[PDB]
Ligand binder design. Structure first.
Ligand code: CDL
Ligand code: CDL
Ligand code: PC7
Ligand code: PC7
Ligand code: PGT
Ligand code: PTY
Ligand code: PTY
Ligand code: PTY
Ligand code: PTY
Ligand code: PTY
Lengths: 57, 85, 218, 387, 64, 443, 75
C-alpha cells in the first residue's frame, strides 16, 4: 500500500530535479553563466593583444 | 495614504470575528454577521488612518514652511500630496 | 551591486578630505550654562583638588545606601531596644557614617590615582582610568576569598572603560553627526538647509556636544 | 458675554439632570443601570472639545465605563474625568492643584467602595496608605507653589521651585523610588480600578506636560531608578499583580526617557500602544491571549509594542543620550525573561474557560478581540503617523 | 533535444532587458523619495505648546 | 509579491481544516511547503546571470520591506525550500506544522530583504517560535530555550540603536543608499558584529548552540543547523561588508583571532563529547568559523567560496542530524555507550552515516571538499599562515568523526533495525544534492 | 562648490532617468565606464552602479583570457 506522502514527494522532488536539469541544459548560455558572455569577448581582445605583444618583442 | 488599507482593514475584521468566536468556544465560521460588521468597521477605520497619513504630511510641511524652512518644489510634492502609494 | 567576484565599496574611496558641511543659516550654538562646580570638577592639573572636587559625589552614593540600611535596621528593632534613644542614634549613625566614609574613601582614591597617572604620563587616554579602577577595586577586594581580589579590580576598571567609551569617546567621534539638513559630505544630494538647528527642550542629561547638533532651550 | 461658555453650563446642567434621573431610577428598585451608563457616556462625549488628546481621553473613558455597575461609581468616574480633562487645559498651579486633588479623592473613594469578599480590608488598607502618601505630596506642591508665588509675584511657572513641582508630577506617575503606593494598590484593589489607574491619569498628566510645562532640570536618575527597579522587581516577584506593577514602573521609565530627550511623538505612540494593551490585559477571560500581551509588552518585533519601544530608542539615539539608552537596552533584555514566564504560565497549559450561568455570556469579548488586533496596526505605525 | 532549443527560445522571448532597467530605476526612485521625505521630517523641533516664541508663526486663537 | 501573498494564505489554511480529517491535514501541510520549492526553482530559471547584481526587485513604499535577488540569497532560498518539506515529514501535530510554516515565511522573507530595519523585523520575529519549539514541555529543555533566546536578544539589542543611528544619519535604511552615504562606521560596525557573531556561532558568544541544537527535535535541529546559522553569513555578505567596509578592514585582526580560536577550541571540545547529537552539534562551529574568515578575507572570489561552503554545510549536517534522530526515535537514547555494531543491524543507515561522515570531513566527491579548497584559496591570498592553521588541523576533525563512527557502527551488534521507507526518503534529497554539487556543480 | 556639485547631480539624475537601450545590448554590461573627476564616486549612485557593472565585466573577461591562454600553452 502506497504511503500518504509518496505521490506528493515524488511529484515535488522530481519536478524540482527536472527543473534544475532544464536550468542547466536548456537556458541560453549567457543567461546560465556570465563566463559564456565573456568567453567570446576575451578571445577577440586576446587576438588584438597577442600581436601587440609580438610587436613589443 | 496607502492604497491597500481597506483590504487590510477587511482582513483585520475577518480575524476579529474569528477570534471572537474562538474566545467563546465556537468554530471560526460561526455567526458570519459578526464577521461582516467587523469587516465594515475595519475597512472604515483603516481608511481613516490612511487619510490621517496625508493630513499629518500636510501639517508638517505647512508648519515647517511658516517657520522659515524653504523647501524646493521638487520636494514639496512628497508632502502636499494625497498620494495613493 | 552584489557579485561573487568582489565588493566594490571596499575599494571606492575619496581621494581628498572634505570641507565642513554647512547645516543651517545660523551656525552658533544655543545652550544653558554649566555650573561652575562642574567646570572646576573637570580640571585634572591639580590631583589633590581633583580628588577634593570629585569625592563628595561618590560619597553621596554611600550615604544613600547607608540611610537605606539604617532604616531597614531601625524597623526591625524590638521595643526594649528601640526606646533607648541614644543607643539607637549611635547604632544608626554608625551604619550611615561607615557607609559614607567608605564611599568617600573609594572615590578619593579613584580620583587621585586617575589624576596622578594622568599627570605622570603627560597625556589623556584610557590607561589612567584602568589603573585607577584596578587600584580602587583592589582596595575594595582586599581581605576576601579568592575570586574577589581579582574580580573587583576588573569590575572597577570595566566601569572606567565603559565610562570612557560611552561618555567621552563616542561623543567625540560623532561631533559632526547631523540628523537634519544636508547629508554630511553629500551636499550634492540636495537636502534643504533650515534657518537654524532644531530647538529641543531636552533635560540636563541630554545636552548638545557640538554647537550644530541642536539648539537646547525653550 | 457668556456665550463662549455653553459647554460649561451644559456640563453642570447634565450633572444636575443625571443625579435626579439616577435617584428616580433607584426608587423603582432597578438592579441594573445600563440606561444611566449610556447617559453618562453621552455626557462624556458632549463636554469634550475637538482636540486629538481630549477625544482620546473621552473615547478611553467611554470604553472604561462598561466595567462599572453602580450609580455612585459612575458619578465618581465622571467627576474624576472632569479633573482629568481640565488638567490638560491648566495653565497655572491653582487649577493644577484642584484637578489633581479631585482625581486623588475620587480614586480613594472608589478603592474603598468597590472591594468585596475577603479582599475588602486589604483594599481599604492600601487606599488609606495611598491617601496618606498623597496628602504630603499635595502639601509639598502647595508649599513650593507658595514659595514661587512669593518670589515672582505672578503665576508663571519659572525658577528653582519648579523642581519640586516636577517631583510632584513624578509621584503621580508612580516613578521609582516613589513607586510603592502603586505597588500597594496593585496587590489588593480589583481589576477594573487597576485598568482605570494604568491608562487615563497618565494620559492626562503627560498632556499637561506636553502643553504647558518647562523645567531647567533633569529626570535621568529617576529614569535609571524606574527602569532598573521595575525590571528587577518584576523578575523577582512571583505574584502576577506585583509582576504587572513592576513592569508598569519599567514602562513609565521608558516614557520618561522619551520625555527627557524631547520628541513627544514617540511618547504618544508608545503610550497609545500601552493603553490598548492595558485594555486587553484587564478584561481577559481566555488566557491564551495573555501570551499576546506578553509578546507585545516584551517589544518582540512584528507586534505593536516593538514599534512603540523602537521609536523611543531611535529618538534617544538621535540626540545621543547614550548612557540612559544603554540602561534601557539592558532592562529591555531583562524584561523578556518574565514575559516569557507569563507565556510559560498561560500558553503552554491546557485550556479551560468557564461558561456563564447567570447570563451576560463572556461580556467583554468584543473589546478584547478588537484590542488583540494590534497585530494589524503596525502597518500604519511604520509611516510618519504620530507626528 | 529540440525541447531544449525551444525552451531556450522561450527564455529569450520572455526576458525583457529594458523592463529590467525600468524596474531598477523605479526601485531607486521610490527609495530616494522615502529618504528625502524622512530627511526633511527629521528637522523636528519640540517645545511646549505655550512657547509663544518657538511657535511664533502658528495661527493660534486662545480662549482663556 | 502577489504569488507570495497567495502562498502565505494557502499555507495559513491548515488551521481551518477540522482535526478529524487526518489524511487531509498531512497532505495540505506537506503541499504548502512543496509549492515554494517549485516557485524558487522557477526564480532560478528566470535569473539572468549576465545581467544586474540585483534582479526581481520590489519595494513596498514607505514601510521599509524592500526585496531583491542576488546569487547568495538565491542559493540559500533554494536550500531552505528543500529543507522545509523534510521537516514536515518529521512532525505529527498541527502546532508543529504551523510553527514551521511561520518559520518558513520569516526565513524566506529575511533571506532576500534589502532593508536593515526590515531584516531586523523579519529575522528576530522568530524568537518566540524558537523558544516554544525548543522548550516544549515533556521532551524539550527550557534552559536551552532561555539560552538561545537571551543570546539572540542581547545581540539584536546591541544592533538596534546603531541601525537607528545610520537611519538618522542619512535618512534611510535601504542598503543601496546606506552604501553610498557617509556614515560613522565604527559604531554601526560594532552593532552588526554583535548580531552576526551570535547568529554565526563565534566564541565567546556561542554557548547557546550546544544546548539548543541538541534539545530541539529532529526537524528543529535540521532547521537550526542547515538554515538559521547562515543568516549571519548572509548578514555579513549583504549588509555589513557593503555599508561599513572601513570597519571591516580595521576589525580584521580581531575577527581573525576570534575565528582561529573558535575553530581550534571547538574542534578540541568535540573530541571529548559523549553524546552523538552533541558531537554533530559542535562540529558546525568550526565550519562557520572557516566561513567567517573566508568572508572577511575579501581576497579572490570570497563571496562565492563562502556561499558554497554555507550550502555544503547546509546539505551535510542536517543529514547527520537526521541519522541521529532516527537512532533516538527508535532507541530512545542519544548516548554513545548504548550503541555498538550498527553496521550489522542497520546496514543502510550505517552506509548513509559513513557517506555523510566523509562529507562532513571535506573528502572529495562531496561539495565540502570544493568548498574548503576555495575557502582556503581565499584565505591563503591574504597570508599563507592563516591558511596553514586550518590545513594542519585536519587530523583533529577526522579524529572525532572517525572515532564517533567507529564506536557506534562496529563491534557487537546491538541496537534498532534498519531504516524505513519514510526515513530513507527524508535522507534522500540531501544525498542527491551532495552527489551533484560535489561532482558537477557548475556549467 | 556646493552649487556645481548639485547641478552635476541633477544632470546625472536626468540622464539616467531618460535612458534606454535595445538590439542585443544588456544594460549592466556597459561598453565604457563613465569618466568623472569626483572625489568618492559613491557621491553619485548611478555612476557608482554603472562603473560597478563595468568593473564586474572586466574581472570576468580577464578570467576568460586566462583560460584561453592556458589551453594554448597546454597545446
Ligand atoms: C436581506 C438580507 C437579510 C440581512 C441579514 C443580516 C445578517 C444577520 C444579522 C442578525 C441580527 O441582526 O441579529 C444577530 C444578533 C442578535 O441575534 P441573537 O443571536 O438572537 O443575539 C445573540 C445575543 O443574544 C445578543 O443579545 P442582544 O440582542 O442583546 O444583542 C444586541 C446586539 C446588537 O444586535 C441587535 O440588537 C440587532 C442587530 C441589528 C438588526 C438589524 C439589522 C438588519 O449587540 C451588538 O451590538 C453586537 C456586537 C457585535 C459586533 C458589532 C460590530 C462591532 C464593531 C466594532 C469594531 C470591531 C472590529 C474592528 C476590527 C479591529 C481593527 C483594529 O445581533 C448581532 O450580533 C448584531 C451584529 C451585527 C449585525 C449587522 C450585520 C451586517 C453585516 C452584513 C452581514 C453579512 C452576512 C449576510 C447574511 C446572508 C448571506 C450569508
Ligand atoms: C452623541 C453621542 C452618542 C453616544 C456616543 C457615546 C456612547 C457609546 C456607547 C455605546 O456604543 O453603547 C454600546 C451599545 C451596545 O450595548 P448593548 O448591546 O446594550 O450591550 C451588549 C454587551 O455590551 C455585549 O455586546 P458587545 O460587547 O459585543 O457590544 C458592546 C458595544 C461596544 O463595545 C465596546 O465598547 C467595544 C467596541 C470597540 C470599538 C471602539 C471604537 C473606538 C475607535 C476609535 C476611532 C477614532 O458594541 C458595539 O460595538 C456597539 C457600537 C454601536 C455604535 C457606537 C457609536 O451600543 C448601542 O446600543 C448603540 C449606541 C450608539 C448611539 C446610540
Ligand atoms: C555569489 C555567487 C553565488 C554562488 C553560490 C554558491 C552556489 C552553490 C552551488 C554552486 C552552483 C553554481 C551554479 C552556476 C550556474 C547556475 C546559475 C548562476 O550563474 O548562478 C546564479 C545563482 O546560482 C544559484 O542560485 C545556484 C543554486 C545552488 C543551490 C543548490 C542547493 C539546493 C539544492 C538542494 C538539493 C536538491 C535535490 C533535489 C533532488 C531530489 C548567479 O551567480 P553568479 O553567476 O555569480 O551571478 C552573476 C553575478 N552578476 C549577475 C552580478 C553578473
Ligand atoms: C489561539 C488563539 C490565540 C492566539 C494568540 C497568539 C498570540 C501570540 C502567542 C505566542 C506566539 C505563538 C504562535 C504559535 C503559532 C503556531 C501554533 O502552535 O499554532 C497553534 C494555534 O495558533 C494560532 O493561533 C494560529 C493562528 C495565528 C497565526 C496565523 C494567522 C495570522 C498570521 C496551533 O494549535 P495548538 O498549539 O494545538 O493550540 C492549542 C493551544 N494551546 C497551546 C494553548 C494549548
Ligand atoms: C507582513 C507580511 C509577511 C512578511 C513579509 C513578506 C513579504 C513578501 C515576501 C517577499 C516578496 C518578494 C519576493 C521575491 C521576489 O523576487 O519577488 C519578485 C518576483 O516574484 C516572485 O516570483 C515571488 C516569489 C515568492 C515566493 C518565493 C520566496 C519569497 C518569500 C516567500 C513568502 C511566502 C512563503 C510561503 C511558505 C509557506 C517580485 O515580483 P513583482 O512582480 O511583485 O515585482 C516585479 C516589479 O518590481 C513589480 O513590482
Ligand atoms: C542525471 C544527471 C546527468 C548529468 C548532468 C550533469 O552533469 O549536469 C550538470 C548539472 O547537473 C544537473 O543538472 C543535475 C540535476 C539533477 C540532479 C541529479 C539527478 C552540469 O551540466 P553540464 O556540464 O552537462 O551542462 C553543460 C551545458 N551548459
Ligand atoms: C574619608 C576619606 C576622604 C579623604 O581623605 O579625601 C580627601 C579629601 O576629599 C574629601 O574628603 C573631600 C570632601 C571635603 C569636605 C567637603 C582626598 O583624598 P586623597 O587625594 O588624599 O586620597 C589619597 C589616597 N590615595
Ligand atoms: C548599563 C549602562 C550604564 C548604567 C549606569 C549608568 C550610570 C551613569 C549615567 C550617566 O552618566 O548619565 C547621567 C544621567 O544622570 C545620572 O545618572 C545622575 C547620577 C548622579 C550621580 C549619583 C551619585 C550618587 C547619588 C546618591 C545615590 C542615587 C543613585 C545613584 C546610582 C547623565 O549623562 P551625561 O549628561 O554625562 O551624558 C552625556 C552624553 N549625552
Ligand atoms: C482600535 C483600538 C481598540 C478599540 C478601543 C479604543 C481605545 C480607546 C481610544 C484609544 C486610547 C489610546 C489613545 C492614547 C492617546 C494617543 C493620541 C494622543 C495624541 C497624539 O499622539 O498627538 C497628536 C497625533 O495624533 C495622532 O494621530 C496619534 C496617532 C494615534 C496614536 C496611538 C497609537 C496606537 C494605536 C498630535 O496632536 P496635534 O499636533 O494635532 O496637537 C497640536 C495641538 N495641540
Ligand atoms: C558596547 C557595545 C560594543 C561591544 C564591543 C565594544 C568594544 C570596544 C570598542 C573598540 C573600538 C575601537 C577603538 O578603540 O576605537 C575607539 C573609536 O572610538 C569610538 O568611536 C568608540 C565606539 C565604540 C563603541 C561602539 C559600540 C556601540 C554599540 C551600541 C551601543 C548601545 C548604544 C550606545 C550606548 C577609540 O580608539 P582608542 O581610544 O582606543 O584610540 C587610541 C588613540 N586615540
Amino acid at each position: 500500500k502506497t504511503l500518504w506522502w509518496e505521490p506528493y514527494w515524488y511529484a515535488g522532488f522530481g519536478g524540482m530535479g527536472v527543473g534544475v536539469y532544464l536550468i542547466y541544459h536548456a537556458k541560453p548560455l549567457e543567461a546560465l553563466d556570465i563566463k559564456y558572455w565573456a568567453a567570446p569577448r576575451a578571445a577577440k581582445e586576446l587576438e588584438t593583444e597577442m600581436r601587440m605583444l609580438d610587436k613589443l618583442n | 495614504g496607502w492604497a491597500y488599507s481597506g483590504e487590510w482593514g477587511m482582513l483585520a475584521g475577518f480575524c476579529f470575528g474569528t477570534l471572537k468566536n474562538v474566545q467563546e468556544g465556537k468554530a471560526w465560521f460561526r455567526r458570519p454577521y459578526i464577521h461582516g460588521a467587523g469587516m465594515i468597521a475595519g475597512y472604515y477605520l483603516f481608511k481613516a488612518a490612511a487619510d490621517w497619513e496625508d493630513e499629518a504630511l500636510k501639517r508638517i510641511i505647512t508648519r515647517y514652511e511658516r517657520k522659515g524652512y524653504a523647501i524646493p518644489e521638487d520636494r514639496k510634492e512628497l508632502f502636499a500630496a494625497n498620494q495613493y502609494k | 551591486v552584489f557579485s561573487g567576484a568582489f565588493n566594490t565599496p571596499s575599494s571606492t574611496t575619496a581621494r581628498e578630505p572634505y570641507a565642513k558641511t554647512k547645516s543651517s543659516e545660523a551656525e552658533y550654538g544655543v545652550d544653558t550654562p554649566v555650573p561652575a562646580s562642574a567646570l572646576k570638577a573637570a580640571d585634572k592639573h591639580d590631583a589633590l583638588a581633583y580628588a577634593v572636587a570629585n569625592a563628595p559625589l561618590i560619597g553621596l552614593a554611600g550615604l544613600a545606601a547607608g540611610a537605606q540600611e539604617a532604616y531597614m535596621t531601625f524597623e526591625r528593632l524590638p521595643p526594649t531596644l528601640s526606646r533607648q534613644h541614644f543607643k539607637q542614634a549611635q547604632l544608626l549613625l554608625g551604619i550611615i557614617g561607615k557607609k559614607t566614609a567608605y564611599a568617600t574613601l573609594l572615590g578619593a582614591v579613584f580620583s587621585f590615582t586617575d589624576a596622578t597617572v594622568e599627570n605622570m604620563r603627560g597625556k589623556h587616554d584610557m590607561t589612567s582610568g584602568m589603573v585607577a579602577g584596578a587600584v580602587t577595586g583592589f582596595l575594595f577586594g582586599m581581605g576576601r576569598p579568592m575570586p574577589q581580589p581579582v574580580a573587583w579590580p576588573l569590575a572597577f576598571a570595566g566601569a572606567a572603560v565603559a565610562a570612557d567609551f560611552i561618555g567621552e569617546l563616542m561623543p567625540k567621534y560623532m561631533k559632526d553627526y547631523r540628523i537634519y539638513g544636508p547629508v554630511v559630505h553629500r551636499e550634492n544630494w540636495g537636502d534643504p538647509v533650515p534657518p537654524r538647528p532644531p530647538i529641543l527642550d531636552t533635560g540636563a542629561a541630554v545636552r548638545p556636544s557640538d554647537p550644530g547638533q541642536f539648539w537646547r532651550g525653550y | 458675554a457668556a456665550a463662549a461658555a455653553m459647554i460649561e453650563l451644559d456640563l453642570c446642567f447634565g450633572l444636575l439632570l443625571l443625579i435626579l434621573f439616577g435617584l428616580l431610577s433607584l426608587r423603582n428598585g432597578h438592579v441594573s443601570l445600563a440606561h444611566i451608563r449610556f447617559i453618562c457616556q453621552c455626557w462624556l462625549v458632549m463636554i469634550t472639545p475637538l482636540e486629538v488628546q481630549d477625544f482620546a481621553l473621552c473615547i478611553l473613558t467611554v470604553v472604561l465605563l462598561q466595567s462599572f455597575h453602580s450609580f455612585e461609581a459612575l458619578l465618581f468616574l465622571l467627576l474624576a474625568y472632569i479633573g482629568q480633562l481640565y488638567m490638560m487645559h491648566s495653565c497655572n498651579l491653582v487649577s493644577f492643584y484642584v484637578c489633581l486633588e479631585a482625581q486623588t479623592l475620587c480614586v480613594v473613594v472608589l478603592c474603598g467602595l468597590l472591594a468585596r469578599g475577603a479582599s475588602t480590608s486589604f483594599s481599604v488598607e492600601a487606599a488609606l496608605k495611598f491617601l496618606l502618601l498623597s496628602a504630603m505630596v499635595s502639601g509639598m506642591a502647595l508649599f513650593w507653589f507658595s514659595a514661587m508665588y512669593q518670589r515672582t509675584g505672578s503665576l508663571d511657572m519659572v525658577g528653582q521651585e519648579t523642581f519640586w513641582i516636577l517631583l510632584v508630577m513624578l509621584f503621580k506617575l508612580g516613578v521609582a523610588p516613589m513607586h510603592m503606593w502603586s505597588v500597594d494598590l496593585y496587590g489588593s484593589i480589583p481589576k477594573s480600578l487597576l485598568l482605570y489607574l494604568s491608562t487615563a491619569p497618565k494620559l492626562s498628566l503627560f498632556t499637561f506636560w506636553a502643553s504647558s510645562w518647562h523645567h531647567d532640570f533633569s529626570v535621568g536618575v529617576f529614569i535609571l531608578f524606574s527602569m532598573f527597579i521595575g525590571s528587577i522587581g518584576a523578575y523577582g516577584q512571583p505574584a502576577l499583580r506585583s509582576l504587572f506593577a513592576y513592569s508598569t514602573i519599567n514602562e513609565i521609565g521608558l516614557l520618561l526617557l522619551a520625555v527627557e530627550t524631547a520628541g513627544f511623538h514617540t511618547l504618544y505612540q508608545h503610550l497609545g500602544i500601552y493603553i490598548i494593551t492595558q485594555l486587553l490585559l484587564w478584561n481577559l477571560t481566555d488566557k491564551r491571549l495573555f501570551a499576546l500581551c506578553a509578546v507585545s509588552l516584551a517589544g518582540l518585533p512584528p507586534f505593536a509594542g516593538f514599534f512603540g519601544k523602537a521609536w523611543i530608542f531611535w529618538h534617544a539615539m538621535s540626540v545621543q543620550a547614550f548612557s540612559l539608552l544603554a540602561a534601557a537596552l539592558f532592562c529591555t533584555l531583562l524584561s523578556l525573561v518574565y514575559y516569557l514566564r507569563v507565556i510559560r504560565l498561560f500558553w503552554t497549559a491546557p485550556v479551560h474557560t468557564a461558561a456563564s450561568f447567570t447570563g451576560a455570556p463572556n461580556q467583554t469579548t468584543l473589546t478584547s478581540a478588537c484590542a488583540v488586533a494590534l497585530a494589524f496596526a503596525p502597518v500604519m505605525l511604520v509611516k510618519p503617523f504620530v507626528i | 533535444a529540440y525541447i531544449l532549443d525551444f525552451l531556450s527560445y522561450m527564455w529569450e522571448k520572455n526576458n525583457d532587458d529594458s523592463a529590467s532597467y525600468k524596474e531598477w530605476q523605479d526601485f531607486l526612485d521610490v527609495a530616494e523619495k522615502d529618504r528625502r521625505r524622512d530627511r526633511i521630517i527629521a528637522w523636528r523641533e519640540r517645545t511646549m505648546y505655550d512657547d509663544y516664541a518657538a511657535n511664533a508663526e502658528e495661527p493660534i486663537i486662545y480662549k482663556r | 509579491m502577489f504569488i507570495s501573498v497567495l502562498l502565505i494564505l494557502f499555507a495559513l489554511c491548515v488551521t481551518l481544516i477540522p482535526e478529524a480529517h487526518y489524511h487531509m491535514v498531512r497532505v495540505w501541510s506537506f503541499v504548502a511547503t512543496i509549492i515554494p520549492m517549485w516557485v524558487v526553482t522557477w526564480m532560478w530559471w528566470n535569473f539572468d546571470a549576465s545581467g544586474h547584481g540585483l534582479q526581481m526587485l520590489v519595494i513596498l513604499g514607505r514601510s521599509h520591506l524592500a526585496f531583491g535577488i542576488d546569487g547568495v540569497a538565491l542559493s540559500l532560498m533554494l536550500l531552505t525550500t528543500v529543507l522545509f518539506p523534510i521537516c514536515m515529514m518529521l512532525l505529527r501535530t498541527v502546532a508543529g506544522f504551523m510553527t514551521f510554516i511561520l518559520l518558513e515565511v520569516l526565513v524566506l522573507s529575511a533571506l532576500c530583504v534589502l532593508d536593515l530595519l526590515g531584516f531586523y523585523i523579519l529575522f528576530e520575529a522568530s524568537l518566540i517560535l524558537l523558544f516554544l519549539l525548543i522548550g516544549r514541555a515533556p521532551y524539550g529543555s527550557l534552559e536551552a530555550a532561555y539560552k538561545i533566546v537571551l543570546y539572540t536578544m542581547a545581540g539584536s539589542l546591541v544592533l538596534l540603536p546603531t541601525l537607528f543611528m545610520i537611519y538618522s544619519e542619512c535618512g534611510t535604511t535601504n542598503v543601496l543608499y546606506m552604501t553610498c552615504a557617509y556614515n560613522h562606521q565604527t559604531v554601526l560596525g560594532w552593532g552588526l558584529l554583535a548580531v552576526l557573531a551570535v547568529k554565526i556561532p563565534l566564541m565567546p558568544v556561542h554557548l547557546w548552540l550546544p544546548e539548543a541544537h541538541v534539545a530541539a527535535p529532529t526537524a528543529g535541529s535540521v532547521l537550526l543547523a542547515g538554515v538559521l546559522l547562515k543568516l549571519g553569513g548572509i548578514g555579513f555578505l549583504r549588509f555589513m561588508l557593503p555599508v561599513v567596509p572601513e570597519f571591516c578592514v580595521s576589525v580584521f585582526p580581531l575577527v581573525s583571532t576570534l575565528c582561529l580560536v573558535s575553530f581550534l577550541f571547538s574542534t578540541l571540545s568535540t573530541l571529548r563529547q559523549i553524546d552523538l547529537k552533541k558531537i554533530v552539534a559542535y562540529s558546525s562551529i568550526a565550519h562557520m568559523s572557516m566561513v567567517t574568515l573566508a568572508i572577511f578575507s575579501q581576497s579572490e572570489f570570497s563571496a562565492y567560496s563562502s556561499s558554497f561552503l554555507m550550502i555544503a554545510h547546509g546539505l551535510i549536517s542536517p543529514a547527520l542530524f537526521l541519522i541521529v534522530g532516527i537512532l533516538y526515535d527508535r532507541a530512545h537514547t542519544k548516548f554513545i555507550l548504548y550503541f555498538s555494531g550498527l553496521g550489522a543491524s542497520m546496514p543502510i543507515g550505517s552506509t548513509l552515516f559513513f557517506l555523510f561522515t566523509l562529507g562532513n570531513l571535506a573528502f572529495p566527491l562531496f561539495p565540502n571538499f570544493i568548498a574548503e579548497v576555495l575557502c582556503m584559496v581565499s584565505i591563503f591570498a591574504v597570508h599563507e599562515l592563516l591558511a596553514y592553521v586550518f590545513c594542519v588541523c585536519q587530523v583533529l576533525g577526522a579524529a572525532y568523526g572517525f572515532w564517533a563512527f567507529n564506536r557506534v557502527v562496529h563491534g557487537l551488534p546491538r541496537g534498532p533495525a534498519d531504516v524505513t521507507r519514510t526515513e530513507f526518503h527524508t535522507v534522500l534529497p540531501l544525498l542527491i544534492g551532495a552527489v551533484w554539487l560535489g561532482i558537477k556543480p557548475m556549467a | 562648490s556646493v552649487e556645481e556639485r548639485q547641478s552635476f547631480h541633477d544632470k546625472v539624475n536626468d540622464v539616467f532617468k531618460n535612458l534606454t537601450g535595445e538590439a542585443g545590448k544588456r544594460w549592466a554590461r556597459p561598453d565604457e565606464p563613465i569618466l568623472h573627476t569626483l572625489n568618492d564616486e559613491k557621491e553619485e549612485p548611478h555612476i557608482f552602479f554603472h562603473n560597478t557593472n563595468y568593473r564586474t565585466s572586466r574581472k570576468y573577461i580577464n578570467v576568460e583570457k586566462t583560460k584561453i591562454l592556458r589551453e594554448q600553452a597546454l597545446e
